[PDB]
Amino acid sequence: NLTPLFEELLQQCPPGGQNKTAHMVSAYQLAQGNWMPTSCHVFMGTISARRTKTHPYEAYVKLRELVEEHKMKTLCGSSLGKHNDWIIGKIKYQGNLRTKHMLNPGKVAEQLCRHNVYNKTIGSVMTATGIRLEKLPVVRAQTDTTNFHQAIRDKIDKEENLQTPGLHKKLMEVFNALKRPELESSYDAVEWEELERGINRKGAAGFFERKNIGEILDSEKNKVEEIIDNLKKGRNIKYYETAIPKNEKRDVNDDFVDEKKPRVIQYPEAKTRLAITKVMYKWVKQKPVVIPGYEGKTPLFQIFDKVKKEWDQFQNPVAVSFDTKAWDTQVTTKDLELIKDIQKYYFKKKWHKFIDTLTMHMTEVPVICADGEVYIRKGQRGSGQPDTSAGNSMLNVLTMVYAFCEATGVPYKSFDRVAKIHVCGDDGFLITERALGEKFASKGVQILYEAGKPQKITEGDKMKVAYQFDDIEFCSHTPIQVRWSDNTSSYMPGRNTTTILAKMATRLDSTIAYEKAVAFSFLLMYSWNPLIRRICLLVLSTELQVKPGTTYYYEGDPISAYKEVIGHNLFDLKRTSFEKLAKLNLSMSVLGAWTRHTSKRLLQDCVNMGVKEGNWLVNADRLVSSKTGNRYIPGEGHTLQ
């Protein structure tokens, strides 16, 4: 009766270990009365209790008393580490972050250095069909300095999560169930050439740097090699991260979902990022993949077909979603230490002192904000570290297998026999049989809280379950089935039409070639969406002399290029799933972004252009060509990046 009240309190208790000595009672037994909490330390949703016949509300006031007693004797003195001392010398002005859990030593001197504009061609195409641009959500919000420091105080300014005693030994036992011993002690640094192939030269400079990635490559390689040398020998470097709001000028990726970035971007200097990537390439880029389920290298237009083939081998498949609240701030020092031990498993012994020193620097990180304010972060992850994707994915896989096995009784070495997991940093889900998944979905919240990865406050304290394939959510997307004219069916990455329109029509800048790279990219993703697909085809049909400039672009003909990645011709897309299309279209009607005329004014504009003589891309749309009589004859075309 009082059970859900206790379930909520137990997610405020400090995690503890087993007891045996004392009777260990759950939130159920507590609300049944006649149990008195001896301690507030929780182990698997149990607490210790003396059978002294209490009132259920006396028990609750007791446990709550024990917890608040604990919380005030625990919020207490962070001595700065010698290797971070150098940042104090650069301090010039008093701090004003008002942080309650990490040092704010002050503010350094300001240093010597983008708004949301429309893509005019793409935007005018939408305006031309009655899509009302003013009703579309804002998709690239820039935070001002005051809400930025608020985001720091709100999300970063925290003490490290308590975790179950012995957790990381258990996680290490999960790792040993899925290591790849044929790769142990084999990873070595890579050559400049391999590094330079896969690296964005626009990659951002840190607070004290001036040159970006490409400029350091061109003229300051010796500075990167010196950092490698220091770390390799175990000497300290002047390691620091810079903090910027999401969608700031320096918010640039070194390598369609961009919602997978936190509000505060924290990133090491470009010299330092190159140093880490040169040595740890094979691990941070996952070449080869050793993280089970890792999908960070699978294209979004492929991922759901791959998952479908696994869903299809279960009697009663369900998927349980991982939804950790602000994952990067929940990463603890013991978590980083676990990743370090795993890296050292795969790396040759000559890089172990490198790995150790890097990790030490990452456990207490000086962070400089854009405005110069300094804070000292304990643990956590900066979203811009080269290890973010690989470290987070591995950490997520271990913690989720741990939680599932503790929850269901399945032993770690038996996970691969009853469940399939997929991860992209903190994002992911596992597929398994309905009984197993429902048992994991109810208990996972409390176990994952005690493992130091609290889940987003869900409905009834259960994790989200998908009972049908296309209710799965992953990388901001969800499966939508399409029908091909060869009588096959496949799945594409679905997402709300309102969100696709806003992403397509807007840009941060400080050219039609870029708009056609966007249109081709969105065509690769969203050709299941008749409205997106037709706008793409029109924009691509604009100024055909101009080559395209941006996750993907096409050499030669975009329609051929499409046929290469997707494996069908655009013209063979017969049908999109009726129900899932209606779901993904609802916010068009809720926001008033379209009207009853919009779908036909768009089709008409395509027919109007496609009946004309020539070779028109719009005629690659099955239904447009149906009404023009003309077809599109492709040239020779290839997808690149």
Residue numbers in the entry: 13 to 88, 90 to 126, 131 to 272, 278 to 532, 538 to 576, 579 to 670
Report text from the authors:
In order to investigate the function of the NTD of CSFV NS5B, we first made an NS5B construct comprising residues 1–694 with only the C-terminal hydrophobic region removed. The structure of the WT was solved at 2.5 Å resolution in space group P43212 by molecular replacement using a BVDV NS5B structure comprising residues 91–672 as the search model. The structures of the C-682 and C-672 were solved at 2.1 and 2.3 Å resolution, respectively, in the same crystal form by molecular replacement using the structure of the WT as the search model. These three structures, each containing one NS5B molecule in the crystallographic asymmetric unit, are highly similar with root mean square deviation (RMSD) values of 0.4–0.6 Å between the WT and two C-terminal truncation mutants for all superimposable α-carbon atoms with 99% coverage of the resolved residues in the structure of the WT. Although this conformation is likely not compatible with de novo initiation, normal activity of the WT and C-682 observed in the polymerase assays suggests that the canonical conformation also exist in solution and may be in equilibrium with the observed bent conformation observed in the crystal structures.
Compared to the RdRPs of other Flaviviridae representatives such as the NS5 of the Japanese encephalitis virus (JEV) and dengue virus (DENV) in the Flavivirus genus and the NS5B of the hepatitis C virus (HCV) of the Hepacivirus genus, the pestivirus NS5B contains a unique ∼90-residue N-terminal domain (NTD) that does not have notable sequence homology to any other viral or host proteins. The global conformation of our CSFV NS5B structures is consistent with the recently reported CSFV structure with an RMSD value of 0.9 Å (95% coverage) between the reported structure and our representative C-682 structure. These structures together reveal that the NTD adopts a globular α/β fold with an α-β-α-β-β-α pattern.
